[PDB]
Every structure is written in structure tokens, then in C-alpha cells.
Design a protein around this ligand. Structure first.
Ligand SMILES: Nc1ncnc2c1ncn2[C@@H]1O[C@H](COP(=O)(O)OP(=O)(O)OP(O)(O)=S)[C@@H](O)[C@H]1O
Ligand SMILES: Nc1ncnc2c1ncn2[C@@H]1O[C@H](COP(=O)(O)OP(=O)(O)OP(O)(O)=S)[C@@H](O)[C@H]1O
Ligand SMILES: [Mg+2]
Ligand SMILES: [Mg+2]
Lengths: 419, 419
């Protein structure tokens, strides 16, 4: 049986399974405790029990193994990993480990692992002889990540406007500069849906920082790819280590020539958490934010690259502006030139209830020649030069009106060039 | 003789009963001591006595049972609860327990429990088989919680303005941002009156932190639901204790598919109490607040959710701004985007003594489409569009004039659309 199989079950199953196995009062305690008790009960019987999850390396090799569906929460069900097999298998943070697990002995309250049978969805010997992520030489974006679903959905206009506005490809470094109440959440939702539909091969990851629980639940129940979120209730160190786990897992996955995509909401909140967790270095900029505090997020946002050998790590992270707190924009101008893809959203368009509220004139993508063919690039250039004089609200209303009466992007282009 | 019913009766009747029961003095000490003396005399008479209250768990199972009448104050009237009963019936903090009570033997001075006959207003056997609040999947608010009183009064006007400013539903997480002397207290009065009048089924409780005793007495003698308050005389430890007791009781109640509503005045004072009670973590932010000191209040404010299984927990906590103390706006910055409903009040409108003083443009709610219908949603949309341009003072004057002209919200909407 699988520990992951237990964790994917709902909460009520504790009555069906826990009580049937002889447990007395699993009704009233935290879910990880129910999982721990049931799996201890099953282990006492003696049958083989499986396990899997993402590896974490502590400061002294006191390794742990967390679960993705639990948002990497430190719980009793975490799998202990001694330094001996860490040295033997040359493991590190972010490694996906699957195999046998051992019932705890006296003096231990964590389930250690007997022997691993899969590392990063591959044999341990094949995973051992893999070069590090940072040794890989980056490149520019080559493969285009088209967001046009093509299913004729009623919400597909957002994806179409995204395709016309800013091209997204493998290995880009993207920013979504938007005010509050502008449509960031469901824009990222549409991006995730389009990625899951058009590109099932690439691994899709969504990361949510200090977000309300209802949005977390909706995101979990909507996107097909795995999503990890930490709420605002949880402390700053929780946010930091969740982000570290996500980035290490992405690096390990892309080390195997796999395309990884990370949607981040939001880089501003992650930067705030890093600022409030990093010890003061004596140099504080305007807004009560340390200098080296932004150093850690940039690395997280700097891992987006197109690996020459194989694979690509794409990061689309949204940023917050004009929230009333000056720290937000103070972070903002430290992130302007660091991204190669940028998308502006404006409050004024959202006020007119016109969605998606995209500032087409100001948003754009650099080095787009390497990502698209010349003919549709020329069509986009013609659209840009005929849309530049118009105001952003006028531009969006005209664009949605024109796109409503078409079917696909090519149909829109041919209709536009006919006129 | 119920302990609660004798607590409800004022001090004069307690003294009269003590005199009639052959007890000397009992006139120059606190209410708890008088109640203890009366209960001791009745126990020595020999008749069976029973009580009720809310459980509290200490650090070693040294269980106590408080009463909401005395605002959860630690006194002789509290009821002892042994760890044996806790392990037997599977109790935890916040459980509402009623049943037989026992006079103390030699060596102890606290009442024990012979047996429990009601747990959380339910049979004790069925109370154990309940899922934790942390294991319940949150959702967005679905059922609209209308605030319009509908009796055609004049204070209901304020409530009517609420239905025009920000929709409130079951499970909202709302913040009332207001400067000093802007109408917070009687706005909460109106909200509590509407809750107790339109929605008698839902459980309403009002929590007051470091509020003046006269305001506490005004609160208690007006609202229908039970109210708990701690004045600024008591130390911050009692503020934290009362807030934790309230949130635990709300969680226990909502675990039974009940609708719980909490009104908090104010979250800033609770944050101050947590800051001045939590030990320093070595990382102090601007304003003299510890980094993790704000972790605890957020949890209290993060419990507002709509449970898919059943029931809901709504929290309306007010916040203070422009008070001249930097800690207040630091806390406000740390609580800006955490809530899904905002109600902004301004001293500018209150200066002209136009009430309610609401910053209509800034105030609003998040994705109210799941709460209300459509046609009145477009009614509110066009009302916002036509009220957006002019200033807040003029907007409120126009709104109160038009609302006084009509009778109900539907009448207001039809009068607006016909003209
Ligand atoms: N493509 C769209 N179609 C229809 N309505 C939309 C669309 N995009 C946005 N909206 C509406 O605009 C609002 C956007 O809400 P959200 O996306 O939740 O806001 P947000 O970007 O998450 O910012 P926060 O979280 O509130 S600070 C909602 O009222 C939506 O109904
Ligand atoms: N709806 C209303 N009708 C009539 N008078 C009102 C109304 N709302 C507010 N006021 C007046 O405005 C003031 C509001 O007083 P409070 O609500 O007690 O102030 P507050 O918001 O509680 O701030 P604090 O706690 O006193 S610093 C009083 O002078 C009221 O008479
Ligand atoms: Mg959002
Ligand atoms: Mg007041």
C-alpha cells in the first residue's frame, strides 16, 4: 500500500478504514496523526508498505522526506532519511525518492526508508551520474509555448489575447505587473489550463504564497498539475522553505531534460517573507527592507533559463504594484530589467469590467524573433502599429470585439489584413 | 439550582439569597466569591447541583471549565476537569460541557464533575465523532447574509448603506478600517442587531479587546447573542486568553455544521497584546513589533471560511488607522490583502457629522457574484458607476438623501432606474 494513496483519500475515510483496523478514537485529531496511526497499525501486521516524496536536507544531514499534496508540511508522516544513504546515493534537496519504508524503532518517531527503488522517476544509478543544474549553459527561448487552447472555450479569449500580447516560450523569465483586483488569479488559472491542455508533456507547478485558503482550495480543485500553497496564517519561514522545496524540485526535474513550468503568486510576497526572515545586515533601503533580503528571491527568479543540453525551466511570477505599501514598488524597481517577458495589467480597464485587463501597448516580450515565424511576427507588428495610438481601454475593447467574431488567431489575422 | 441562572441574577439577589440561607457577611467581596459561598452552602445542604461552561486545557491536562458570563475570568467559580475525563470522552479546548458538578473534598477547592450530560449541545457519544476544523475544506462564501433590517426604522439606514457598500455572506473575512471617532462601535451595534434580527439561527458572539468598561456595558445590554469583553485594566495575557477561548469555541461550534459569527473590536489591539506577550524572536520590524508576533493574530483572523461539509465561520474584525502610532499602520500593512471584504471609514465624512461615514469607493467585497443574484448585481454596478466620480462626502450625502426618499433597497433601485 502507498502512503501517497492514503494522503490522497479524503478525511472521512478515517471512520471507514481507521476504525475497521481496530483504532479507537481517530475521529478527533489532525489528519497527519490519523495517517500516522493507520500506517503504524498496518505496519504492525507486517506487510510491505511503500513510500515516496520530495527530499529535504537539514543542516547536519538529518534528512527528511515530505509529501507534495500536504504542501511539504512538517508532519509526523514525514519519512526519515539518515546521512548514510544520502552519501551512498549522492542525494540532495529536491530529489524525488520512492521505495520501501521502515517502521520506527524505539527512540524514533519517524518512518525511515529501507531501500529506494526510484529516484527522480529513474533508476538510482542513472540519477547518480547527472550533472548539476548550474553547470548547464543557458540560452534564449527557442520552443514556443502557444497558449491558444483551440477548443473554442468561452474563456479562451484571455489565452488568445495573451498570445497576441506577449509570446511565451520554454525557458522565459516572466513577470505579471498588475494592481490588486485586476485578474491575476484567473489569468494564471487560464495559463495553467492552457499549459495542461496544449502541452501535457511539460511538468506544470503552481506555487502560492500567503494566499487565502479559499483560493488555495479552488486552485487545487481546478488545475490538473500539482499545486503547492502556503497560507498567510503560516509563518514566513514556512513560505521560504516551501519556495526552496519548489525551486529545488524544479531544478532536479529539469536536470533530466524535462520542461518545468512554475507559476508564482506572488514574487512580491515571497520577497517580503525573505525580508522578514533574513537577519539584518546593517544596510536597510527605503521602506524598512534589507539589501541582501532581495538577494534570495532573485536567485529563485533567476533560475528561469533554456538549458542547452536539454530541458527548460520557465517561471511566470506575478508582482504587486500600487497597493499603498511602499515596500511593494521598492521591490518592483528591483525587478524591472531582470525579466525577459513582461505583462502589464491596469486597474482602469478592470474598472470598466472589460477582461482580461491587459495593457497591450506597455506589455511585450523581448527577443521574440527566435520564438516565432516571420509571417505571424509581421502580422503582430502590423497589429501593434495599428493599435499603438489607441488608448488601453479602447485597445482592449477593440481587440475583444474583433476576436469575438473570429474563430482562431489565424482567422483574426486574415480578417484584419483583409480590412 | 443552575450555576448559570444564579450567575445571571444581579448581586443584590445573591446577597438576599445568602442572607436567607444562613450565611454571614457576603456583602463586601466579588461576585465569584459570593457564588462560591452559595454553592458551598447548597452542597452542604445535600441537594444535587449541576452546571455548564466552556472547557480550557492547561499545559498538563489540568483542565478548567470557565463561564462566558464572567468573560472567561479565572476565579473560584471555575470547575475542575481531571485528565481522566478528558481522555475518556475525548475533549479539547472550546468544548461546551454541561452536567453534574461535585463539591470539593479536603485538599482541593474546585468543583469537579460527577458526569457530563451534554457536550457541544449534543450527546457526548456523538460529539467525539466529529472532524476537526483544520481538516475541513474551505470554500468561497455562498449564502448571502443580508443586513437590511426591513422594519422601516431610521438606524437601519446605516445597515441599508452596508447592503450598498459591501455584500456580506456566510464565511466572509472582513476588515473595518476606520480612524478614531468614526462610528465603529455603533456600526458594530447595527451589524449585531441585523444578525440577531434577520438571522436568529446563526450563532453570534462579540469579542471586545481592551475596551472601556462603559462601552462593554453598553455592548452587553443591547446585543442578543452572548458577548465577551476584556477591558484595558486586565493585562495582555488575558486579552490573548479571551481571544483564544473565543476562537476555539467558534471552531468547536462550527464543527457541528453551525453558522458562527464573530465581531472583533479590535484586531489592532489583539495584535498589540500578542506582540507584548510573545517572547522576542530577535527579528524586530518597524514599529517595535516582533516578526512572529503577528503570526498568532493572523491565525485568529484566518479561521474565517465556508466549510464544504456544513456550517460556516464569519469574522468581522475592525482595524484602526491614522491613530498617530506607527505600530497601528504597520499592523494594517501586515493585514491589508489578507481579508476578502473591506469597509473603509473616513474621518472627513464624520467631521461633517454625516453617518454612516463610509468611504464607498474604497470599500468593497471580493467576487460577490457567488453571493448575490445578477440583476441586482448590475443594479449595484450601475450605482457604483454613477457614484464613482464625486467625492466621498457628496456620495454619502446623495446616498442618504436617496435612501431616505425611498423605503426599501428594491424601492431605491427601482427609483434609481426609472429616473
Ligand atoms: N476573463 C474574465 N472573465 C470574467 N470575469 C473576469 C475575468 N477576469 C477577471 N474577471 C473578474 O474580475 C475580478 C478578478 O478577480 P481575481 O482574479 O480573483 O482578482 P485577483 O487578480 O486574484 O486579485 P486579488 O487576489 O483580489 S488582490 C473578478 O470579479 C472576476 O469576476
Ligand atoms: N448612525 C449614526 N447615527 C447617529 N449618530 C451617529 C451614527 N454613527 C455615528 N454617530 C455619531 O458619531 C459618533 C460615533 O461614536 P462611536 O461609534 O462611539 O465612535 P467609535 O467609532 O467607537 O470610536 P471610538 O471607540 O469612540 S475612539 C457619536 O458621536 C455618534 O453620535
Ligand atoms: Mg488573487
Ligand atoms: Mg468605540
Amino acid at each position: 500500500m502507498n502512503l501517497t494513496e492514503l494522503k490522497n483519500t479524503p478525511v472521512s475515510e478515517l471512520i471507514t478504514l481507521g476504525e475497521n483496523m481496530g483504532l479507537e478514537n481517530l475521529a478527533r485529531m489532525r489528519k497527519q496523526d490519523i495517517i500516522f496511526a493507520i500506517l503504524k497499525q498496518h505496519a504492525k501486521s507486517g506487510e510491505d508498505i511503500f513510500g515516496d516524496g520530495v527530499l529535504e536536507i537539514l543542516q547536519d544531514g538529518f534528512g527528511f522526506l515530505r509529501s507534495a499534496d500536504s504542501s511539504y508540511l512538517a508532519g509526523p508522516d514525514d519519512i526519515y532519511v539518515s546521512p548514510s544513504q544520502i552519501r551512498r546515493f549522492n542525494l540532495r534537496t529536491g530529489d524525488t525518492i520512492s521505495g520501501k519504508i521502515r517502521p520506527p524503532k524505539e527512540g524514533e518517531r519517524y518512518f525511515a526508508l529501507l531501500k529506494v527503488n526510484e529516484v527522480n522517476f529513474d533508476k538510482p544509478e542513472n540519477a547518480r551520474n547527472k550533472i548539476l543544474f548550474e553547470n548547464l549553459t543557458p540560452l534564449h527561448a527557442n520552443s514556443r509555448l502557444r497558449m491558444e487552447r483551440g477548443n473554442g472555450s468561452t474563456e479562451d479569449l484571455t489565452a488568445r489575447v495573451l498570445d497576441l500580447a506577449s509570446l511565451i516560450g520554454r525557458g522565459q523569465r516572466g513577470l505579471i505587473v498588475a494592481p490588486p483586483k485586476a485578474g491575476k488569479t484567473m489569468l494564471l488559472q487560464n495559463i495553467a489550463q492552457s499549459i495542461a491542455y496544449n502541452h501535457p508533456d511539460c511538468v506544470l507547478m503552481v506555487l502560492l504564497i500567503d494566499e487565502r485558503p479559499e483560493e488555495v482550495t479552488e486552485m487545487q480543485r481546478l488545475v490538473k498539475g500539482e499545486v503547492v500553497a502556503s497560507t498567510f496564517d503560516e509563518p514566513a519561514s514556512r513560505h521560504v522553505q516551501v519556495a526552496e522545496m519548489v525551486i529545488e524540485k524544479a531544478k532536479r526535474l529539469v536536470e533530466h531534460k524535462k520542461d518545468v513550468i512554475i507559476l508564482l503568486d506572488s514574487i512580491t510576497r515571497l520577497a517580503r517573507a525573505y525580508n522578514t526572515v533574513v537577519p539584518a545586515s546593517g544596510k536597510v533601503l527605503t521602506g524598512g527592507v534589507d539589501a541582501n533580503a532581495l538577494h534570495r528571491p532573485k536567485r529563485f527568479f533567476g533560475a528561469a533559463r533554456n538549458v542547452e543540453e536539454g530541458g527548460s525551466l520557465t517561471i511566470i511570477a506575478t508582482a504587486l504594484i500600487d497597493t499603498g505599501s511602499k515596500m511593494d514598488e521598492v521591490i518592483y524597481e528591483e525587478f524591472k530589467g531582470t525579466g525577459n517577458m513582461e505583462l502589464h495589467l491596469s486597474r482602469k480597464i478592470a474598472e470598466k469590467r472589460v477582461f482580461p485587463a491587459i495593457d497591450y501597448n506597455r506589455s511585450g516580450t523581448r527577443k521574440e524573433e527566435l520564438l516565432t515565424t516571420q509571417e505571424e511576427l509581421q502580422k503582430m507588428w502590423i497589429l501593434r502599429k495599428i493599435i499603438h495610438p489607441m488608448g488601453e481601454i479602447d485597445a482592449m475593447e477593440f481587440l475583444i470585439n474583433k476576436l469575438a467574431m473570429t474563430k482562431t488567431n489565424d482567422d483574426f489575422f486574415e480578417m484584419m489584413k483583409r480590412s
